[PDB]
Amino acid sequence: QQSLHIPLLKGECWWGAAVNRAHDMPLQPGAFIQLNGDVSGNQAVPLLLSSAGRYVWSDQPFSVKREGDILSISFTGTGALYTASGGSLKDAWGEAAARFFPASGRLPDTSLFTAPQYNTWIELIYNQNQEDILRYARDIVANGFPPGVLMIDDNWFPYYGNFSFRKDRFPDAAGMISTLHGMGFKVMLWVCPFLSPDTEAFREALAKRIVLFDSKGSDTLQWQHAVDPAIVHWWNGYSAVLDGSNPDAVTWMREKLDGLQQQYGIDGFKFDAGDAEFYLGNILSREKIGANEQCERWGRIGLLYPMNEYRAMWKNGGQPLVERLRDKYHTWEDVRKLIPHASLAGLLGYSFVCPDMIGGGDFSSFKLDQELIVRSAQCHALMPMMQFSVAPWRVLDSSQLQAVKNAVALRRQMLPEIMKYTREAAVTGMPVLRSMEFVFPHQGFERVEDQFMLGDNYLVAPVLEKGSVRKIKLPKGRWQEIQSGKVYRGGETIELKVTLNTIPCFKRTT
Amino acid sequence: QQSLHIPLLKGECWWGAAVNRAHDMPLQPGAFIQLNGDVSGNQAVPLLLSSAGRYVWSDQPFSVKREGDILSISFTGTGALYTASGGSLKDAWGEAAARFFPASGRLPDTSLFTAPQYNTWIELIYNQNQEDILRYARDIVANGFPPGVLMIDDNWFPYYGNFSFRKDRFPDAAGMISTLHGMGFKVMLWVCPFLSPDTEAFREALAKRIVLFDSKGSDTLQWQHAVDPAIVHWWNGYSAVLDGSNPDAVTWMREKLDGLQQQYGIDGFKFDAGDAEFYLGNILSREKIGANEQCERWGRIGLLYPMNEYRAMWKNGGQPLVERLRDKYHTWEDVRKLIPHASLAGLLGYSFVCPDMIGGGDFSSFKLDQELIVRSAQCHALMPMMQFSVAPWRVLDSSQLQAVKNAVALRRQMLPEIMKYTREAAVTGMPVLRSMEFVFPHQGFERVEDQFMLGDNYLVAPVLEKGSVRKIKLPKGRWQEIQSGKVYRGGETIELKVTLNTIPCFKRTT
Numbered sequence A, B: 001q002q003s004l005h006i007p008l009l010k011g012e013c014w015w016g017a018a019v020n021r022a023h024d025m026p027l028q029p030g031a032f033i034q035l036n037g038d039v040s041g042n043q044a045v046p047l048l049l050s051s052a053g054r055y056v057w058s059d060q061p062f063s064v065k066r067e068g069d070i071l072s073i074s075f076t077g078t079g080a081l082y083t084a085s086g087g088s089l090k091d092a093w094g095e096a097a098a099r100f101f102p103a104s105g106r107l108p109d110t111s112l113f114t115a116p117q118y119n120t121w122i123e124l125i126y127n128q129n130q131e132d133i134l135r136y137a138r139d140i141v142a143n144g145f146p147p148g149v150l151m152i153d154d155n156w157f158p159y160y161g162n163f164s165f166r167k168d169r170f171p172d173a174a175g176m177i178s179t180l181h182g183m184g185f186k187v188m189l190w191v192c193p194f195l196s197p198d199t200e201a202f203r204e205a206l207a208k209r210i211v212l213f214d215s216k217g218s219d220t221l222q223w224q225h226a227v228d229p230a231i232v233h234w235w236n237g238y239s240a241v242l243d244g245s246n247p248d249a250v251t252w253m254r255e256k257l258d259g260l261q262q263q264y265g266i267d268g269f270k271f272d273a274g275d276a277e278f279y280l281g282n283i284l285s286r287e288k289i290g291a292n293e294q295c296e297r298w299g300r301i302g303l304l305y306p307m308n309e310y311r312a313m314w315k316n317g318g319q320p321l322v323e324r325l326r327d328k329y330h331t332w333e334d335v336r337k338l339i340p341h342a343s344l345a346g347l348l349g350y351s352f353v354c355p356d357m358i359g360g361g362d363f364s365s366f367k368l369d370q371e372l373i374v375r376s377a378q379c380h381a382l383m384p385m386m387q388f389s390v391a392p393w394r395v396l397d398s399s400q401l402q403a404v405k406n407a408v409a410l411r412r413q414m415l416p417e418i419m420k421y422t423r424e425a426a427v428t429g430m431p432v433l434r435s436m437e438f439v440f441p442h443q444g445f446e447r448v449e450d451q452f453m454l455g456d457n458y459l460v461a462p463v464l465e466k467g468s469v470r471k472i473k474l475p476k477g478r479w480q481e482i483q484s485g486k487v488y489r490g491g492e493t494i495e496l497k498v499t500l501n502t503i504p505c506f507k508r509t510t
């Protein structure tokens, strides 16, 4: 029950805890975040950071509330308040990272960065089949988009826990993979730790005792004597679930994943689910770990597969995992979350952050707003990674499509810079996408969330509303718009006339 | 709770309630059978019948106990005691049938009778696949056994609720069916009403509201407002389940079964599960029916598919459904159940009774006892139907194999008689396989369960023990052993010398 009461320093701003709550930060009076058994649909970390260089850490989950000008934190384990003498957000990040989530030195597969990614989810939804995937792939190429990592999303397999292609819809999956390789794509498969609970796979997993067991609400029943599997309700239905605490579950998962790699030439895996909330209730694990750690240990599987992507996470800061922002709606509200979510992810140790799916990644959203799709693409362009799903050529008229292609072109022109800071982030953990406050502390940027720095020297200010005008707050120094070449005096807010094609970006010259 | 309390008449014997309890009948002091929520792994009917012509019926389930010489029945609904004036078992049977389960006039597909049946369950267990099924079928013909109905058992499909062949193990199921038809076989598929509860089929059934719903233990929650499915534990795991009370579930089931017939040319279906026990607990059904009626209504699907077989049943006496004795163990005790089980099934309105599987129908029993297999085959031979699974040519030496073949030959010689009483059974409900007590009342046959009458005129007394001698109790009259042509006077017990090949059968000549 150990608790901690922290008066804010005058003017102090606090961020942390949960990536999918960044739009509610800096934490205001009234704010409440519970981490115990909740990763809020995305990545979560037991870390708060302040604009005054202060930080809070615990190895275990906590809840945080701001009442008035006081932080109240209730820890399940123990935690503490720290001050970095530098006094800035960057100092708080730097000290916290080296103490608690030091950079591993490794990168996720570089193919995830060096071209845009394509996920079949919005185009094909549940109808993942060989013919339509190949067509999507061919359409990418024919429309002049660069081949990249192609993610085949949910429903390519017979049932949950059967790690093979359903032959009804994939008559020659190896051939399909080979063709995709030929066209310059890499291929990733959606996977999860859920098992259809009346199948061969389920019975095999039950017999190997790699599932989570039902406690029967009994205080004293032990893992080693439980016989019935936990059954868990999620968005696709009801399933048994792998016990991430059980080393035999790791072996099983490897067998399945390595199988797909060897049999079909699969390059990597999109690791979905693992959300802490699925591990709550009457559940027994072999090593008696909490729901948050179940999420965390699912996350570690991706350390064995350099080409990976996670949405749900607990900890694993400083690790070579791609951390995708969760399913975004088809709204301007959501396009406005990409920067602050991404920038927060970076500070929680998730430098390799990909901003969900251009135009939105929630399938029931898919009426379509073309402008929004363009602005989504342009916002993705100079983030660490760029991910498509809905086919721009299918839903955009020709100059909206051209604008999207131009966004892709700009990313290719900036790629040496992106890759420079990406490689660096592997070594030092320092983010690729940085908030204005991280790079320009105590210069009035604490609440500027529609601008970010790509490394130290490029200020990107994507257009994220309708109109022919965009305001841009420049730090002290001189700045050169990389496209127009017009030099601007820093230290003020400027107004820029914009078209559908504009992606404001400035090089720091002084 | 309404009830009857019945003093036994002097010498009176009572049978009824549940097929799979017939070995414990006539009901002894201490006997207890609960029907409410329980069909005892097989067919059950709310009927009791006495050697003195008395009978008990209710439309609804009951419990029955004998305490000393009192037979007590406790009804969920209402019921009554009746007396047939002829004063015999057959009179009680005939009156009860005509009042409460009159013969429909119809037959199941006659191919189920006019050749031995073959079921792939014991041969292939869970590994059901095109190549091994065809090999089985070719080994049937190559060993000189007659082509029959071939039943492809559990696990031919991707998951429970997906009514299609798994293309990994059936690369050309239609072709396979065509080849089996060309060899003289017909083909049935195992089906059940369970749904893998995280799959497409599950989500479609949930959306159509054809599943059974979870009541949440609430007394007030109506079907119409429930959103979550009932999840049921069974021998293959955890599943959603169809609501048999819901007419939309009937349509869905017809769509799937008709789909299999049209696409692949499937002749019929083995309808498994449906057991009343699976319908207990926190469950809401559209027409608010009990667990027994869920079993009964699963049974009626077979009214649309003349080539059918069921194990679990509630009521539907007098109907054109094949009723299979359940999974038998590979034991002498279980071989000794075939006759009393089958004869009881006849009295409860199940004339079209097939005695499970030669040698055993429980997979986990598979030191195979060759003699036991032979005697199982011989016991099957002059029953209404004869069903193989384990390959006699794989597990028997040549004498034993020949003896099984001779059993098949005897059945073929006797088939006109079998079919005569089968066609009659459709019209009058009068069983094909009759107990000795049924044909010969008040002659001391009440507890004789190793002999049966095929129709009126053939007394069959299979060898059901080891040794060279078989006792046979002959009713008054004259009896001609059909091989030797020797005539025996009845009204006494003879001892008959037997070999492995002997199937003692006597024609009534007085």
Ligand SMILES: OC[C@H]1O[C@H](O)[C@H](O)[C@@H](O)[C@H]1O
Pocket (backbone or CB within 6 Å): A121, A153, A154, A190, A272, A311, A326, A327, A361
């Ligand atoms: O069900 C598939 C769906 O699952 C989650 O919502 C993911 O975040 C999506 O991107 C998609 O993969």
Ligand SMILES: OC[C@H]1O[C@H](O)[C@H](O)[C@@H](O)[C@H]1O
Pocket (backbone or CB within 6 Å): B121, B153, B154, B190, B272, B311, B326, B327, B361
């Ligand atoms: O699971 C398959 C198995 O299911 C039940 O037990 C049946 O009675 C068996 O004959 C067999 O079909």
Ligand SMILES: [Cl-]
Pocket (backbone or CB within 6 Å): A233, A234, A235
């Ligand atoms: Cl969910």
Ligand SMILES: [Cl-]
Pocket (backbone or CB within 6 Å): B233, B234, B235
């Ligand atoms: Cl069961």
